[PDB]
Amino acid sequence: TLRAAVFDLDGVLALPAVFGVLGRTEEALALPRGLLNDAFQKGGPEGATTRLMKGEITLSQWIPLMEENCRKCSETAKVCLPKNFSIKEIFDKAISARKINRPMLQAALMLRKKGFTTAILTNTWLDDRAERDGLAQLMCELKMHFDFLIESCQVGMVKPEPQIYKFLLDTLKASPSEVVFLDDIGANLKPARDLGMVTILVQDTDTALKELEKVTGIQLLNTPAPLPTSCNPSDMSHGYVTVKPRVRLHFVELGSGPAVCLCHGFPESWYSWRYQIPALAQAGYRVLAMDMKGYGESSAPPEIEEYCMEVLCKEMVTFLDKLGLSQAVFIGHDWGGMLVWYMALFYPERVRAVASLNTPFIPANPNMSPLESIKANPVFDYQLYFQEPGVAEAELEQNLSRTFKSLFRASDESVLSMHKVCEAGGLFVNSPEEPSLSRMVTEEEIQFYVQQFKKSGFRGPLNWYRNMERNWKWACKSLGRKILIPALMVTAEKDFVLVPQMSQHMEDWIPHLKRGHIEDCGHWTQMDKPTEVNQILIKWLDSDAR
Amino acid sequence: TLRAAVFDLDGVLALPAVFGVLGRTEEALALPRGLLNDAFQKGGPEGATTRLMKGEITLSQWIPLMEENCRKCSETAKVCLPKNFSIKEIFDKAISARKINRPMLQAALMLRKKGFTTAILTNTWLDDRAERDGLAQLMCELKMHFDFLIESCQVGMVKPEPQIYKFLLDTLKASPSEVVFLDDIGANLKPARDLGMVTILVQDTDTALKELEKVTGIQLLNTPAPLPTSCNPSDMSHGYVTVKPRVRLHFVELGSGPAVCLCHGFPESWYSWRYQIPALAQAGYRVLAMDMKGYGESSAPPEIEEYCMEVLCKEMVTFLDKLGLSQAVFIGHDWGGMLVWYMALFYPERVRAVASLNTPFIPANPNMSPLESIKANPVFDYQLYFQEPGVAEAELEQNLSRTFKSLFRASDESVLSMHKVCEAGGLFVNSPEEPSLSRMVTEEEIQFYVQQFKKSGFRGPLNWYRNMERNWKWACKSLGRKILIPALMVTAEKDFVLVPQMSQHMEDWIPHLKRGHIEDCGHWTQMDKPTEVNQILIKWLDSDAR
Ligand SMILES: O=C(Nc1ccc2c(c1)-c1ccccc1S2(=O)=O)N1CCC(F)(F)CC1
Ligand SMILES: O=C(Nc1ccc2c(c1)-c1ccccc1S2(=O)=O)N1CCC(F)(F)CC1
Structure with missing residues (x-):
């Protein structure tokens, strides 16, 4: 029986997903499909993105490495990036457009209210951009509502590496059968499932919540308007x-x-x-x-x-x-x-x-x-x-x-x-x-x-x-x-x-x-x-x- | 022997004096000399200004009463106010231009350091203007450095009424011979003198401070650069x-x-x-x-x-x-x-x-x-x-x-x-x-x-x-x-x-x-x-x- 709910940040607790903006930019700029997305994951576990998500480098150090990967990707596809192409500008906008997924938060709040241990497990970066505060505010509002926040760049581990799942399990003080894990990336869902955790692939929120309520036996969807956040005097x-x-x-x-x-x-x-x-x-x-x-x-x-x-x-x-x-x-x-x-x-x-x-x-x-x-x-x-x-x-x-x-x-x-x-x-x-x-x-x-x-x-x-x-x-x-x-x-x-x-x-x-x-x-x-x-x-x- | 120093605000602790801007406006607008100044003091103790300084009315309620007095004054002098004439605009600017008289504050700080009881005695108003914060900030910075702040609009009394001087004496817990009183208005200096207080007519700061140092026997002028304000842990x-x-x-x-x-x-x-x-x-x-x-x-x-x-x-x-x-x-x-x-x-x-x-x-x-x-x-x-x-x-x-x-x-x-x-x-x-x-x-x-x-x-x-x-x-x-x-x-x-x-x-x-x-x-x-x-x-x- 479940007693812990783990949620991803991008595509799960926060919407629209920052990842999905790479595809939006490709469509808007009429660039070859998957070009920006491919430059983003270039080199896999040895690449700039993995180093960024592990916390080896900051977001500002990463921006020119992504630009270099974007050039190399366009060169192979025999195409060119537009005159005013800016990765910073694309991510600044994507991060700023990303807001809390209110019904997902309300579900997490209801689960914690019913005795669940809740956690956010995310692949994130060390944001040193001049506009980093918007994201700092998002994280502050979100984190307060959960028992744990596990960030890849803080723990030096990344999804889908099996280490992070064992780290999550240990932070939770819970066996994998007691854990429901929600993610928008099927690949990042795989090791949690392989461990014995109940997993939910999150595409639309409603279906994910129907799946979450069926598996927990707690009403989360169509539920009444909750009271505003209160104060715990000792915090x-x-x-x-x-x-x-x-x-x-x-x-x-x-x-x-x-x-x-x-x-x-x-x-x-x-x-x-x-x-x-x-x-x-x-x-x-x-x-x-x-x-x-x-x-x-x-x-x-x-x-x-x-x-x-x-x-x-x-x-x-x-x-x-x-x-x-x-x-x-x-x-x-x-x-x-x-x-x-x-x-x-x-x-x-x-x-x-x-x-x-x-x-x-x-x-x-x-x-x-x-x-x-x-x-x-x-x-x-x-x-x-x-x-x-x-x-x-x-x-x-x-x-x-x-x-x-x-x-x-x-x-x-x-x-x-x-x-x-x-x-x-x-x-x-x-x-x-x-x-x-x-x-x-x-x-x-x-x-x-x-x-x-x-x-x-x-x-x-x-x-x-x-x-x-x-x-x-x-x-x-x-x-x-x-x-x-x-x-x-x-x-x-x-x-x-x-x-x-x-x-x-x-x-x-x-x-x-x-x-x-x-x-x-x-x-x-x-x-x-x-x-x-x-x-x-x-x-x-x-x-x-x- | 002196053990208390009292300072006025306008023309004494703060410069340029807000009062002196009425004359500046007259010169700039080529209006008859003393017209704006006369409309300001119109009705004497029964007038709008006295009611304002006693706290019967706020600054915003006073502005149209001053405008009415300005019309009546121009009518008698057989002149006209310019097309874009605004009392609010004139006072907004005058109040905003008024800054602390740093050497006067340094003298007050040195006197308090040497065991003096210091006080600000001022004829002021209840400022409800949209820009009131600038003045609120000025008063905050100033007041902290003194034992007392006596404001006419708070005590319902005004200078030169003898009541305020007896109130000041009682707040100070001091006999008039123990008090040095500094003011830029000779009329407001008169009742303090008539009571037996050492009085200083303040025109230029330097002369006022030479007078203040001669009378107190404490060096206040040309003295070394003082340390910044420190913190009293209990305040x-x-x-x-x-x-x-x-x-x-x-x-x-x-x-x-x-x-x-x-x-x-x-x-x-x-x-x-x-x-x-x-x-x-x-x-x-x-x-x-x-x-x-x-x-x-x-x-x-x-x-x-x-x-x-x-x-x-x-x-x-x-x-x-x-x-x-x-x-x-x-x-x-x-x-x-x-x-x-x-x-x-x-x-x-x-x-x-x-x-x-x-x-x-x-x-x-x-x-x-x-x-x-x-x-x-x-x-x-x-x-x-x-x-x-x-x-x-x-x-x-x-x-x-x-x-x-x-x-x-x-x-x-x-x-x-x-x-x-x-x-x-x-x-x-x-x-x-x-x-x-x-x-x-x-x-x-x-x-x-x-x-x-x-x-x-x-x-x-x-x-x-x-x-x-x-x-x-x-x-x-x-x-x-x-x-x-x-x-x-x-x-x-x-x-x-x-x-x-x-x-x-x-x-x-x-x-x-x-x-x-x-x-x-x-x-x-x-x-x-x-x-x-x-x-x-x-x-x-x-x-x-x-
Ligand atoms: O007395 C109040 N309120 C007030 C606050 C709390 C209680 C009562 C009244 C009251 C009256 C009757 C029975 C029990 C109670 S009670 O103890 O539940 N007011 C007068 C001053 C004010 F106008 F500023 C605010 C309103
Ligand atoms: O040890 C220090 N400072 C420091 C702070 C206070 C004192 C000493 C050193 C010291 C050294 C020798 C004798 C007496 C004293 S003392 O007790 O007056 N540092 C190392 C770590 C750092 F780099 F972060 C800051 C500098």
Whole structure:
């Protein structure tokens, strides 16, 4: 029985195959059939190509050797190469045109999810071309999803040499009958088969996947849309910045490009952005996913005043100061969304662009205090329950697993009454002791929040709600201002704390405001609709944020 | 007696003054004298400009109000503004042309060095222009060098209102007689003087500095070339990446732009790059200063094999994998320099560009083992002393302060014989118990290395020398290759371990190699000649590394 799946790169995990471009060039240039392909494999195991694939020479050293082989091949066929013939130009284009074979990757991802050990086994070169980065990016995106990457130029061995197959077997710690091997070259498939491995000749993807699913007994074709790539906390780059003597800010960092600062809500973590971090980094951005003040590995001072908007925003500016960032795109959800609008109002020079998920921008009423404005419009009754220090902390910290299981639920899973909290005397009074697991989270993901919240508890997080009067007074200084930097407002149809209708007047204060809307989405936007969030954010970032 | 220096921004710390461009535009456009300047201050404390400087409105909201004032002013003077007149265009240009007043900053830096509390007090706006980043960058570079930055638009107060002066005094925790205040506007100087502060009207910088030095009794003018900005370890962003179960890599991170990975030598730290980190980040790069495996906050496994080049390079690739970086510019010194040439040979797709300080690239001799090649060319006798596990560790760890004080010395400070180590039986036998402090280091900088080396000691660092045969065998696989990506070789005239002559044949293996040379520079390149290093690296990075 199979427990390992091995995939080739060219013609298998990446399409169109770079090899097949030699034939395309022959047809386009009206050269004799197989001429370029013959010059490519000239000398067989002793030839320039084998030396390149073994890593004896780099791609740039190989280019003139292929050109020499091309001349010798044309000479025998009694023909001539065109005036502007360039091997570099042909391969630059072929490599650049080659993209991931998404359904093949999805199949590999499903097999690994079902307990398979996956590997990429490829005949490749040491790319030292001025344009090598495009390929470096392709390999990076691909490799992360597999247990192993065996490259011919790294191991000094090549397909179809039997050595590489024995090396693959040993890397896999598996006997050949436990291995399914997928390749587009029949010759490279032969030694794996001769060893006893299940082999698949890959021409079209669909047939190869039908063969793969028949042989593994796992559904891989026509299967539902998978969730975006998530984050394994121990495989992340963890950053720590001291913003003042008693305050340190923790963040997770992934990618290169314009800095994108992700700001979570209550009672969350940097981990609430797990489905956005890999997607945003893949889209060409440097993601900085925060543990906001009071949370996870960030400092949680006890004082209420340490959590007013003025202090939080000032510390985020200091955070940018110490990291050497003149700007960052600020993306917030919930209380993070509120922080991001205030960063745009008070520090526009430090905010490249501003985006909020669910949290609208509503200017302060200079006549009514928010301690009295609650309750007026809807019922923010739970906010009144959050005011008295120690009360909500006691209920929220009693059983952490129950707290996150009860709170982190989709719109059609509510076990919590949004309001009547200060009548019933608690958020969890009509809730079970052992809540069911929401379809949005695994048991493992709940236990990450449990472990995170064991360090500082709910005092710091609840203190974000305890500066109503302080925040209002500070917000009143910004009343004559408008947000004129690029801005995105993303509403969630079924968020009952933050109803889309609350955002309707925003264009009066942010005239050039751009929008997004997610249907059948509750309060926990990022984990409820990750695919939609990523497409709305990536589209807006590529259009409005460098 | 003075203990605090306060500087204005426009016309004082930054030149040319943005205010003086209104007059320049009047002259260029042949408009009535003072017209634009009058429209700018129209309404005095009730006018658009005061509201802007108090932070009631943003710069973009102000632009059309200034345009309206410009029309009203021209109407009274019975004149007309030109067809293509644009306030935004005028200010965009004025702000962009404004640069730091370097000698004024150097004076502020010298005063802070001599125990002064320094501050910037400025009348500024909330910049929400599409080009706001240029100003954000200016403020970032400037602010880091001062204890305080008081901005009118942040404090809701403006110069010359007496409130701001009382606010400044309170921020400073100082009585007005202890304060020297520098400004280009006589009116804004008046309330500070009326309070009892020493005031300086700044027209030309030189006179202002003569006045400043006479009043402080500190030499500020004609003073020597200062050292580049260094790093305070506690004000840095510290990053941690787990590359494998037992290995975590620590790094310091500063800046935005192309990733520049700094790799130290033996027995060093990320801190060996203290003078390069702020300079390189200022030059438009994202600096990642490593604690190499075996050092500081990075893991130090005991096994010798954990330190062979193959493993170290593979882990640096994994480091890039986990941070989401397809490439980084690799800059190494000493053993770090050796690592960087091997990264370029084995992983060219992951190396944007390669630079080495002192360490040359010399291909392996496939006939002679390096355990026998030592000694042949010079005398690498100390390397033989480093071989036996536990011996060099005992001497190097006995007294840490003595170790770093003895090793970290300029060319004309040697208390150490480079060789005859394995005859005399130790690196420190003819060295004092209490070495003098080298002119290259302060006592505080030595104590940072002491504290760093208290965690893991010298086992891991010395293990870099204990894989001679392993490294040679791996290097022999690269013998047919050439380094064809952008490369820089920087030689140090007085490095006696790495003599410039050792690098002479490099062009045979790196044909397009670029060079740098530092005269009167010993082995500790970065701290010996920081200014020269920064100019050679910045020049090469801007030319060859995106
Ligand atoms: O209080 C919030 N959100 C918010 C976040 C998390 C939870 C609730 C509300 C809530 C409300 C009622 C019961 C349980 C819970 S809960 O613990 O699941 N907001 C006010 C400030 C803001 F506008 F910035 C963002 C929205
Ligand atoms: O050993 C080195 N450098 C090096 C680094 C640090 C010290 C010495 C040598 C040395 C030599 C003799 C006495 C004291 C000392 S010391 O402890 O001050 N190199 C060989 C490998 C390389 F080529 F990669 C870089 C250069």
